[PDB]
From a paper:
The KCNH family of voltage gated potassium channels includes the EAG (ether-a-go-go) channels, the ERG (eag related gene) channels and the ELK (eag like K+) channels; these channels have roles in cardiac repolarization, neuronal excitability, cell differentiation and tumor growth. A defining characteristic of KCNH channels is their large N- and C-terminal cytoplasmic regions. The N-terminus typically includes a Per-Arnt-Sim (PAS) domain, while the C-terminal region includes a domain that strongly resembles cyclic nucleotide binding domains, but which has been shown to have little affinity for cyclic nucleotides. As already stated, the role of PAS domains in KCNH channels is unknown; it is not known if these domains bind small ligands or mediate interactions between the channel and other proteins.
Crystals of mEAG PAS domain were obtained by removing the first 26 residues of the domain, which correspond to the disordered region detected in the hERG PAS structure. The asymmetric unit cell of mEAG PAS domain crystals contains four copies which, excluding the N- and C-termini, are very similar to each other (rmsd for main-chain atoms of residues 28 to132 varying between 0.2 and 0.6 Å). In contrast to dELK, all four structures in the asymmetric unit of the mEAG PAS domain show cavities that overlap with the one detected in hERG. The high resolution mEAG domain structures reveal multiple conformations for some side-chains, in particular in residues surrounding the cavity (S65, T86, I97, F109 and V111). Strikingly, the volume of the cavity in the mEAG PAS domain varies among the different models generated, from a minimum of ∼111 Å3 to a maximum of ∼136 Å3; the largest cavity has as maximum dimensions ∼8 6.5 6 Å. Only the conformers of V111 have any effect on the cavity properties, the remainder of the variation comes from adjustments in main-chain atoms. Unlike in hERG, the cavity in mEAG is isolated from the bulk solvent by a lid formed by a tyrosine side-chain (Y71); this residue occupies the same position as H70 in hERG (at the mouth of the cavity) but its larger side-chain occludes the opening. The residues that line the cavity defined in each conformer model vary but, in general, the polar face is determined by main-chain carbonyl groups from residues S65 and A66, as well as by the hydroxyl of the side-chain from Y71 and thiol groups from C67 and C128. The apolar face is formed by side-chains of apolar residues: V83, F87, I97, M99, V111, I113, and F130.
Residue numbers in the entry: 25 to 137
């Protein structure tokens, strides 16, 4: 399922703001739900020096183009600890086939990277 840690982003507003974050994501990221809500579901609030900038660009284009893609990406927990995440980005469509949300699912792959 990989539903341990996830957020939902609003596909129909610029920057795809997070409209839901589960307890797992808050724990994994180090950020309280209050701090995550309305941030970009691209999670650029977690990017930093070591984050691969080509990967950041591919992640942006995935949202921009309403695509389904997944990435390994070096991000930073709230306390500045660097962590390798596996991130899956998946558009969610309504019954009229319009993309309304993005489901973004995350796991820590630091141990295996």
């Amino acid at each position: 399922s990989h539903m341990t840690n996830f957020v939902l982003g609003n596909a129909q507003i610029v920057d795809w703001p997070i409209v839901y974050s589960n307890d797992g994501f808050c724990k994994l990221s180090g950020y309280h739900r209050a701090e995550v809500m309305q941030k970009s579901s691209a999670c650029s609030f977690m990017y930093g020096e070591l984050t691969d900038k080509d990967t950041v660009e591919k992640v942006r284009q995935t949202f921009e183009n309403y695509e389904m893609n997944s990435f390994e990406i070096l991000m930073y927990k709230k306390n500045r600890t660097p962590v390798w995440f596996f991130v899956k980005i998946a558009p969610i469509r309504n019954e009229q086939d319009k993309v309304v949300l993005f489901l973004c699912t995350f796991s820590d792959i630091t141990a295996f990277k």
